[PDB]
Amino acid sequence: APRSVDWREKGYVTPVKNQGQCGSCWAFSATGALEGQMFRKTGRLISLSEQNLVDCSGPQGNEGCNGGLMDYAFQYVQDNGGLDSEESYPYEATEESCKYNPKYSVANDAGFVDIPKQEKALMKAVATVGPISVAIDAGHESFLFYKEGIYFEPDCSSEDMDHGVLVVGYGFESTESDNNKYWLVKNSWGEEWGMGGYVKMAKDRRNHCGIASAASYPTV
């Protein structure tokens, strides 16, 4: 596979968004992965509605601001036959009744692919598919205050993930410890967080923070 991948340079990725004070990371991860696959198919990058998923994907198993799963989000778009754009169905950071309107749907998918729980398998998917939805253990003060460099948290769990994010690539950079590989991760905490809203997470370091444990993408 390539040593370095950055799907932002290919036009697959919208600007960093902000979920606010709502447990809806899973919806931002899902829209990001679907935004990439819709671009792959149509050549048009359109921001998609997280509020659509928060409000409407309950029947697939999601719980709005109280958590959810990207796979469930991908299931909703398939079962629902569409997903509205972000401009038509903007984000309110609160759970409301479903207001989906198919006339403003800009995205569809025919299911989703679960990536084996191997960092090598995740690398193959990022190199060939596009941005991938992943779950990580982000429940550490070090993650809140991250600014730059490769993020490594010794107390991160590979099995207790609590935060959905989007792998848009991977790469390397020389470091003190010679642990130079990283996943390029788009967060949904606004661009003031981290590096323009992005973080470089340690790659090939015992599945750090569980990044390969719950990876998937929509089929478009």
Ligand SMILES: *[C@@H](O)[C@H](Cc1ccccc1)NC(=O)[C@@H](NC(=O)OCc1ccccc1)C(C)C
């Ligand atoms: C990210 O904003 C969100 C925060 C949160 C963590 C734990 C519990 C609630 C909310 N993280 C997730 O949604 C989390 N999902 C998760 O733990 O899946 C289990 C689940 C919880 C609630 C409803 C349905 C499933 C990420 C995506 C792993």
